[PDB]
Amino acid sequence: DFPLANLFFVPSEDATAFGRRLRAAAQQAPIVFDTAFGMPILLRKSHITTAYRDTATFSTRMFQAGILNGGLAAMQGDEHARMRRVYNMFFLPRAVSQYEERFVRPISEQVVDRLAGKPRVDLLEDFAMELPRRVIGELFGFPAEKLHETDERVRAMLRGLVRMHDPAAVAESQRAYGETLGLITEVVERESRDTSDTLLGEILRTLKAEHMDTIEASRQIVLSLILGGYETTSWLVANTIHALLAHPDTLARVRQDPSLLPAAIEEGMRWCPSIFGVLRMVERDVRLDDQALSAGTVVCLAGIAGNYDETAYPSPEVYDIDRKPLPAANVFGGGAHFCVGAPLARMEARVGLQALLARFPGLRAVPEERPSFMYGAKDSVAHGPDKLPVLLHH
Ligand code: HEM
Ligand SMILES: CC(=O)[C@H]1CC[C@H]2[C@@H]3CCC4=CC(=O)CC[C@]4(C)[C@H]3CC[C@]12C
């Protein structure tokens, strides 16, 4: 029914190639069948907006088939709303700013410290991944190093959530989750005791108060903070750094005026998104204009296909932090499932980049070796760089 295409697993040293490829496809067809994901990809903005809104027709029930079953993302309707309110409490604005003061800022300074005394580093492994890892460590009360040991299992878990029709990816996802459950069980057990003094402890306490603290619910809260809070957040920071490093005049301006960091992050999400969109399951035969989707089909909403719509964002290939209005983020999903941790991720990007920019006025990309970009970078489910080598000193 749909044209076939390979939208995602395509390397380039041009960070805009991904955004431009999706926009190009959207001009050819509203829906394409991706040969690597093995599912229809919705590219048309009105179709995506409809899909996000009509949750009875476009559900997240595909997540009942894999490792997210039992967690928030797999829930629908009232069960979802009820668990969502619980999660919501911990990402309210005041809670976020409490995290910023009490640990994101000190951790950021510590991470930057470890970069001192070296002439060159890779800001991907040594910053973008380090900072979110240590934040989750703080929320768990467990050493960041412990999470670092899970990197490969974490990425294996995520790959199967996207390519959920691929038996090898799904099996490795399930197996990786099994190989991480000892860890997850240890963390849950510790912070579920009355002696817990961690944010995770407070969350488990809240689930307990609502009589929702089943083994699976508690494990899924930890799983989401790892998959989202650590791995997925890393790529947002990485892409924001690449955008600044690639545009040294904008980087200098941001260093001179760190109040611009929110605009740098948002434009970065338009210009170099780390995620394409979301998955939904079609619950009933539906037609979207001339396109028909059959009940039971799993689809991807590629909300980022509009990031490079020139009629919406002129000169879309230009990383312009001064755009008015600032682009609406498409990397957090939509509808009732819109990412609940996004406020934490956005704050970490700002607070970490501030600490970095202030400490190294000489910060610049190593002008030799260029980052290579693709969806699937480093075996992730992100579009991001393979490395971000910089020079820190003049
Ligand atoms: C740059 C960082 C992040 C990005 C781009 C991101 C992206 C996403 C996306 C695309 C979804 C699917 C939404 C949908 O189906 O509409 C999602 C959901 C979710 N994420 Fe985030 N994530 C990030 C960080 C985080 C963090 C830090 C946490 C935990 C603190 C988190 C926890 C969750 C949860 C629990 C869901 C399920 C929400 C629901 O179904 O209602 N994520 N995220
Ligand atoms: C529910 C949950 O833990 C969240 C936190 C991290 C999220 C994911 C983050 C990565 C992401 C990229 C996509 O394109 C599909 C949705 C996914 C695969 C998200 C699904 C749900 C996740 C796994």
Helices within the chain (DSSP H only): 17-28, 45-53, 77-89, 93-99, 105-115, 123, 130-140, 144-148, 151-162, 167-191, 199-209, 215-226, 233-245, 248-256, 261-271, 342-359
Say which experimental method was used: X-ray
d(CA 52, CA 337): 9
d(CA 76, CA 70): 11
- Any idea how long the chain is? 394
CATH of 1-394, one of 1.10.630.10, 1.10.3720.10, 3.40.190.10, 1.10.443.10: 1.10.630.10
Q: Which string of DSSP letters, residue by residue, matches 313-371? A: SSSTTS--TT-SSPPPP-TT--GGGS-TTHHHHHHHHHHHHHHHHHH-TT-EE-SSS--
User: Ligand 2 centre from 228 Cα, in Å?
Assistant: 7
d(CA 88, CA 91): 5
Binding residues for heme b: 80, 84, 280, 334, 337, 339
Please give the resolution of this entry in Å, rounded to 1 decimal.
1.9
- Whole-angstrom CA distances from 210 to 70, 125, 136, 218, 282 are 16, 39, 24, 12, 31
Closest residue to atom 13 of ligand 1, CA basis: 333
- The candidate with the shortest Cα–Cα distance to 243, out of 290, 188, 307, is 307
d(CA 92, CA 341): 10
- The candidate with the shortest Cα–Cα distance to 83, out of 191, 226, 211, 202, is 211
Provide the 8-state DSSP code for 90. Answer: T
Query: With a 6 A CB cut-off, is 333 part of the ligand 1 pocket?
Result: yes
Binding residues: 80, 84, 280, 334, 337, 339
- The candidate with the shortest Cα–Cα distance to 162, out of 334, 362, 375, is 375
d(CA 380, CA 236): 13
Query: What is the number of other CB atoms lying within 10 angstroms of the CB of residue 113?
Result: 11
d(CA 259, CA 268): 15
d(CA 353, CA 7): 30
Break positions in the chain: residue before each gap, C to N over 2.5 angstroms: none
Residues lining ligand 2, judged by CB closer than 6 Å?
68, 71-73, 158, 161-162, 223-224, 227-228, 232, 275-279, 381
Tokens of 331: 């990397």
Backbone φ, ψ for residue 300 (5° rounding): -105, 120
Query: What is the number of other CB atoms lying within 10 angstroms of the CB of residue 182?
Result: 9
- Whole-angstrom CA distances from 30 to 22, 33, 176, 179, 276 are 11, 11, 35, 40, 15
Between β-strands 39-42 and 120-122, what pairing exists: parallel, antiparallel or unpaired?
Answer: unpaired
Tell me which of 339, 348, 383 to substitute to probe ligand 1's pocket, judged by most ligand atoms within 8 Å of the beta carbon: 339
Tell me which of 22, 180, 275, 383 to substitute to probe ligand 2's pocket, judged by most ligand atoms within 8 Å of the beta carbon: 275
d(CA 362, CA 254): 13
Name residues whose C-beta falls within 8 Å of residue 381's C-beta, 6 or more positions apart in sequence: 155, 158, 159, 161, 162, 232, 275, 375
Tokens 């983020």 correspond to: 329
Tell me which of 90, 161, 300 to substitute to probe ligand 2's pocket, judged by most ligand atoms within 8 Å of the beta carbon: 161
User: Ligand 2 centre from 339 Cα, in Å?
Assistant: 8
Name residues whose C-beta falls within 8 Å of residue 293's C-beta, 6 or more positions apart in sequence: 31, 40, 282, 285, 286, 287, 299
Query: With a 6 A CB cut-off, is 84 part of the ligand 1 pocket?
Result: yes
d(CA 254, CA 244): 9
Tokens 């800022």 correspond to: 105
